[PDB]
Amino acid sequence: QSFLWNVFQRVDKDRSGVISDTELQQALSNGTWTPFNPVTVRSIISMFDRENKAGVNFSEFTGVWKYITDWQNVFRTYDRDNSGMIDKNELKQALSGFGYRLSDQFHDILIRKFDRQGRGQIAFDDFIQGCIVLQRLTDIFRRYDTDQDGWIQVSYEQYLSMVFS
Amino acid sequence: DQSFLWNVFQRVDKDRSGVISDTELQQALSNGTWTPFNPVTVRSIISMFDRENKAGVNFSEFTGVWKYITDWQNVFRTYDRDNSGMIDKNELKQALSGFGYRLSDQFHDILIRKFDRQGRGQIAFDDFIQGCIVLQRLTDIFRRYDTDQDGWIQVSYEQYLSMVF
Ligand SMILES: [Zn+2]
Ligand SMILES: [Zn+2]
Ligand SMILES: [Zn+2]
Ligand SMILES: [Zn+2]
Ligand SMILES: [Zn+2]
Ligand SMILES: [Zn+2]
Ligand SMILES: [Zn+2]
Ligand SMILES: [Zn+2]
Ligand SMILES: [Zn+2]
């Protein structure tokens, strides 16, 4: 959770510590041998910005790495077989483990717009992303489910307002 | 014409694999902002004319792309009246109304806000495509649900998320 500062300056390839989506685009550990993911980097980068600083700065040279460890192990303790690869069943109890209770028809039809797989099964690339796609959209949904029944009823205007959040 | 497009195809197809990669098409495409054409859209426009699940395009399918890419360019120009090379809020209002959309005023803000990858007060060409695409899909889905044709739908959790593309 706390890793001093050390190299709070030379974090970027150039002088200043103004690292972001465009700069830390290809710096993380992926699982497909292609560059990790622009949209995945961005929702990680948008986790600690005191005043939209675009990177790490006073006492904020700490939280960027901590979110990786809390998910590096989380990918390991749920892979089950330990291969960096998630089967169909290896995600069923992986998601539901951190408090979800999705049914079976969800882990099936997803591999096109947000994903990038070519062999059916999802790797570490879309794992980190796929969850943030999921967790954020639950929090939206919940706010409108004032009844608390898992059944919202929006009109068209609202239906739009919401998927374009 | 037919002979024209065969040369263009030979030109864009760099490796000459016989298939346009989603990178090679990306390179072919401009939107006049010195930023690389939105890959998310290059991805869309391939998974839209590709028949062989090969995530690419042959001459036979390219003929369709080029006609796609063109019909949009005209729409884009038609509506960019202030000739900025981009579509401001009000030009979008005129543009979408043109496809017989019936949307509010605030919503065009939400859409632009969401799709202006550049952060420019307006939307460029490559993101106008995605923005109109995603709006089309969403509206269809909404319509498929609205059985009694109210303008309201009623959906469950997951049902909600499973409508995200
Ligand atoms: Zn596995
Ligand atoms: Zn409800
Ligand atoms: Zn209710
Ligand atoms: Zn090629
Ligand atoms: Zn003009
Ligand atoms: Zn304009
Ligand atoms: Zn304008
Ligand atoms: Zn209805
Ligand atoms: Zn009704």
Nearest to A130 by CA among A160, A94, A84: A94
Residue holding tokens 């401009």?
B30
Tell me the C-alpha distance between A98 and A75, whole Å: 12
Structure tokens belonging to residue B141: 């889905």
Tell me the C-alpha distance between A150 and A161, whole Å: 19
Report yes or no: A150 at the B interface, CB cutoff 8 Å: yes
Cα A83 to Cα A51, A78, A123, A128, A162: the distances in Å are 40, 11, 10, 16, 37
CB pairs below 8 Å between A and B: how many? 71
Q: Is B17 annotated as a binding residue?
A: yes
> Which residue from A103, A105, A163 is facing B138, i.e. has the nearest CB?
A163
Q: Name the minimum distance, in Å, from the CA of B62 to any CA of chain A.
A: 20
Tell me the C-alpha distance between A15 and A10, whole Å: 6
> How many residues would you count in chain B?
165
Alpha helices in chain A (DSSP H): 38-45, 63-79, 89-97, 124-144, 156-163
Give chain B's domains with CATH numbers: 1-165 (1.10.238.10)
Q: Is B146 annotated as a binding residue?
A: yes
Structure tokens belonging to residue A35: 């560059």
If one counts every other C-beta atom within 10 angstroms of the C-beta of residue A153, the result is 14
Structure tokens belonging to residue B93: 């209002």
Structure tokens belonging to residue A163: 């998927």
Number of H helices, E strands in chain A: 5, 1
Write the burial class of residue A33 (CB in 10 Å: 0-12 exposed, 13-18 middle, 19+ buried).
exposed
CB-based contact B9:B59 (threshold 8 Å): yes
Report yes or no: B149 at the A interface, CB cutoff 8 Å: no
> Which residue from A102, A112, A153 is facing B153, i.e. has the nearest CB?
A153
Residue from A156, A157, A158, A161 whose CB has the most chain B CBs within 10 Å, to mutate: A156
Secondary structure class of A4 (helix, strand, coil): coil
Report yes or no: B164 at the A interface, CB cutoff 8 Å: yes
Nearest to A64 by CA among A14, A5, A22: A5
B154–A153 C-beta distance less than 8 A: yes
